[PDB]
RNA sequence: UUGACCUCAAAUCAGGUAGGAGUACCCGCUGAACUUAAGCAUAUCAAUAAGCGGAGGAAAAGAAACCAACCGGGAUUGC
RNA sequence: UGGUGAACUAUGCCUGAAUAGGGUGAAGCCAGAGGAAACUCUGGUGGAGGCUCGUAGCGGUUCUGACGUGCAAAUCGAUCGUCGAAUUUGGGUAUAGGGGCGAAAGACUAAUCGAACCAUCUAGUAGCUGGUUCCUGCCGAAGUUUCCCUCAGGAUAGCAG
RNA sequence: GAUGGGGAAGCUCCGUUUCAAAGGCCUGAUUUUAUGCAGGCCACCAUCGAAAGGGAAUCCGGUUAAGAUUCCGGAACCUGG
RNA sequence: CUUGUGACGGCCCGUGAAAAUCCACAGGAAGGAAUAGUUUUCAUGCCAGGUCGUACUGAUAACCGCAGCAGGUCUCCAAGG
RNA sequence: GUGAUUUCUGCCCAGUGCUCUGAAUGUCAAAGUGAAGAAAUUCAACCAAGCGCGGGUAAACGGCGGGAGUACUCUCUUAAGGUAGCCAAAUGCCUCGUCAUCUAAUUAGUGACGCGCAUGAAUGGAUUAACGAGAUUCCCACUGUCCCUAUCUAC
RNA sequence: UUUACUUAUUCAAUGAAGCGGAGCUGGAAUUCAUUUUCCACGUUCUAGCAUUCAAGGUCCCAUUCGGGGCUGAUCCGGGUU
RNA sequence: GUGGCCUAUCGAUCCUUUAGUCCCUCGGAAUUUGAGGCUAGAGGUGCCAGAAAAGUUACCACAGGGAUAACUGGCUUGUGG
């Protein structure tokens, strides 16, 4: 009974939500996220996972400060009014 | 090369234990048969004469 | 081939010793000043059972000579020690059972136990139940003592090493048959995970050197060289002789 | 006793700086096998892919412990 | 090559929990009797055992029953093994892929195991199988020679344009 | 599972009291006063880990379409000050 | 009958957690009364008790098995013959 | 490794392993030493462990035959040749072995026999109470398994 | 080419507490002139107790509430052993 | 008369080595060792136009094959009848 009766015993999560990415990939016993690598300082990325890099790279979010850097450069980082 | 090993592992030993261990390892029979082979080496010359 | 069972034992994942119900390391009192210039008197408060150990332990209380407090040491109980007995530890201690005299100050034929190898490691030799060390001879110049160990070996150790006079309590245990796989289960359940033992000749050849074949047999000789490597040392390692002697 | 020197510390001491992201191109380390040899082990793939460390608008290199053998040339880079 | 899994399951640890009613009647003890003494006998008491019949529970022997495009990628029915422990089990925790764990079947490691899964190298290689897209006109074969780890393949000569 | 350390080219690995100068505790004293200087005490030595282990203290009656040992009425208890 | 508990008895080469936390004792540091104090482990009296969860199912239809699947999934209460 | 108890575990160290505190130039690396050379280099001596020589070891892996003579003895092979036990056994080709028993009839079962293709002693041998969803034979009871089929209910 | 040495290196313990040398004070000791040495150098019927820079002695201070130094508890070398 | 009366009686590249020329080269210039070349032999591939090479799989896998076995059918009929 490795199929249907064994699927009834599944009610204990191995992963919960992660703090940096909100992914539900944070392993409870390992205390590590399997997608972004929290709590390591570097973010988990691999050159074989180029599509995953495309999924989580810069520009897939809000760019709350980086949207204005090109415009401030074009104006020359001016000050005043 | 043999004398290093006796200093390494047989420094603290007495002759009762030494005789017991060589009798249990069978080297004493080899020493006996080597001296015996010397005895028939002399003895065959004596029988020839 | 796979990694064999005795090869897997050294990682210590499930092969660590079960130490939940143990009462502390049974060591001798440290050799400070009193034990090497005079003696010191302590008291046996209780004799207790140690989990996973065949011998009982003794909880001996001394007074700290430098601070107002009490020290509690765990000794291995000698056969004949009772609760409320005064235990004397030191160079000038009288020769009675339970006292912790150094080996330089006991005569010929003395039976001691919990013997230090070097002076100060707080007990190494003759600690299992019913075992003892006999003093075989002294050597004052180059101050050493010869001792007979429970294995029958004769060691030459320092005369400043200490030992508890008498034999370890709880002797004669292994004379009783266990009679039951349940009894062996409860015996090893508090020691470590080394039981039950599957024979390697009953395995598959991926799992052991002895495994495989259309009959259960070893194949090559079971005597293994000392220069063999891990994964090969399964059998009788470096056997000088085999068989039942008569 | 007092005052130096040397060395080593402590401060939510005064002021600073490093980490992470990106990584097409750049500077290094580490490092395969599929494949080809009509098999295969040196070889090849390849001083490559994957992995790790570190920069900039370029980086690196760069003003000879050079090339030459000629009636000698003259930093580096690229075609 | 680099990562992800012990939510199933294997094993150890830590902390909890669960297990009707019967049968047999072990030590210890009490009374009576006998004996010269050792000690024996009889009647009770007591309630031991990896004992036994048998529920809940755990498992899965047979019908090679049902079903077999099923209720179900392993179930249903009857018959069964076991049922106070080497028992069953929750949660926490540890062990990760030539590695783990195994009362040992090459078993189990998320329906995947005589080496898991994911992505990349990778459009891996194939003397082997299958396919290969409009018309008309003209010419029109070979299965033979020699060499090859050659015998389902090539080179070379021949035949053809 | 950090730190002190020690490996590792490195991502990181070991170790958890270790070859560390590892800290805070009460009385107060002073009443330019702030909290130093009077003192004296103590050496564990991060932290995480149980909604079934340990653990301060609440019960009854009534009430809603849907909440209650939590609201209402009454009657208690514990902790800190 | 279910359950709680007490005093016992049997078993073991099995003798069947730890820490936070609270109390007591030993000790005698120090502070202390006579026109006055000393005591808040006695009684009464005063104030405050933050944050998050709290509905419902828990299974032949609320979970997992592609589903409103005869499967699987821990536990408490338990009337009469 | 073997697998409760009882009773035993015979012979063989030649081979393959394992193991010696034996004896010591046969094999004999790099470094080092010596000679020749102008030097690169060449040639020798010396030379650690391990091999090689000498012992031990079968509850180590394993093995347990022939040929003669005459139960016995002597030879070979290769060390020793199957001891105590057990058997057409789950191990016996021939084989449906031979004898007895069981039946009307038995390639099945059981008890014996043993030149056993190719049984055999911790590769464990023989025996064994109790136990077994283990394999096999016979007997009593019992029955639609069958002679030989018929009928009824629910879906 | 054979033996010792300690500071390199290595192992172990401790909250780095009693190391080494010398000296007292006793005992043995035979001294052949005066001491050569060697052992010791506060604890053993009893499941109590042992802590407040220590009492005492002594010397200062400015007496008072007390405070400090030496000794009690032998010197010397800072090599934790 | 350019071996055996005739028809069989044998071997590439790379590497090593020998003989000859004592000839050519070691590329800044020479001498001498050393090395590399040219011409002709030898060391050998017997699977003989010339890979360096043990098994097992009843746990097995892939690409194919009726070019190829283990049924039936078909031809044959020794053998059988
Ligand atoms: Mg186990
Ligand atoms: Mg085998
Ligand atoms: Zn994350």
mmCIF file of C-alpha atoms (C1' of nucleotides) in Angstrom, chain C residues 32-33 36-39 43 45 63 66-69 83-84 86 88 92-94 99, chain I residues 11-15 17-20 40-41 43-51 81:
data_model
loop_
_atom_site.group_PDB
_atom_site.id
_atom_site.type_symbol
_atom_site.label_atom_id
_atom_site.label_comp_id
_atom_site.label_asym_id
_atom_site.label_seq_id
_atom_site.Cartn_x
_atom_site.Cartn_y
_atom_site.Cartn_z
ATOM 1 C CA UNK C 32 45.678 18.440 43.910
ATOM 2 C CA UNK C 33 47.832 18.823 47.071
ATOM 3 C CA UNK C 36 49.902 13.818 47.278
ATOM 4 C CA UNK C 37 51.086 15.185 50.628
ATOM 5 C CA UNK C 38 48.617 13.639 53.094
ATOM 6 C CA UNK C 39 45.065 12.318 52.888
ATOM 7 C CA UNK C 43 31.679 10.111 52.943
ATOM 8 C CA UNK C 45 26.212 9.126 50.545
ATOM 9 C CA UNK C 63 35.055 19.080 51.458
ATOM 10 C CA UNK C 66 40.152 26.061 49.539
ATOM 11 C CA UNK C 67 36.515 27.182 49.650
ATOM 12 C CA UNK C 68 33.574 26.672 51.978
ATOM 13 C CA UNK C 69 31.564 24.192 49.884
ATOM 14 C CA UNK C 83 26.699 3.881 52.706
ATOM 15 C CA UNK C 84 28.084 6.069 55.445
ATOM 16 C CA UNK C 86 34.441 7.107 55.341
ATOM 17 C CA UNK C 88 40.302 8.073 52.612
ATOM 18 C CA UNK C 92 49.131 8.779 53.749
ATOM 19 C CA UNK C 93 45.807 6.925 53.610
ATOM 20 C CA UNK C 94 45.565 3.626 55.452
ATOM 21 C CA UNK C 99 40.800 3.960 49.958
ATOM 22 C "C1'" C I 11 50.495 14.559 25.098
ATOM 23 C "C1'" A I 12 47.526 15.538 29.802
ATOM 24 C "C1'" A I 13 45.262 18.211 33.945
ATOM 25 C "C1'" U I 14 43.535 22.491 36.641
ATOM 26 C "C1'" G I 15 38.430 27.949 38.464
ATOM 27 C "C1'" A I 17 46.911 26.490 44.866
ATOM 28 C "C1'" G I 18 51.242 24.896 47.615
ATOM 29 C "C1'" C I 19 56.638 23.445 42.264
ATOM 30 C "C1'" G I 20 62.020 23.553 43.217
ATOM 31 C "C1'" A I 40 59.041 12.753 58.719
ATOM 32 C "C1'" C I 41 57.776 18.325 59.143
ATOM 33 C "C1'" U I 43 43.591 15.314 60.205
ATOM 34 C "C1'" U I 44 41.450 7.448 61.060
ATOM 35 C "C1'" C I 45 36.219 3.951 66.496
ATOM 36 C "C1'" U I 46 31.062 7.153 64.849
ATOM 37 C "C1'" A I 47 26.172 9.241 57.925
ATOM 38 C "C1'" G I 48 27.261 16.100 63.180
ATOM 39 C "C1'" C I 49 30.070 20.706 62.297
ATOM 40 C "C1'" A I 50 34.045 23.624 59.737
ATOM 41 C "C1'" U I 51 32.760 30.314 55.486
ATOM 42 C "C1'" U I 81 52.099 21.094 37.359
#
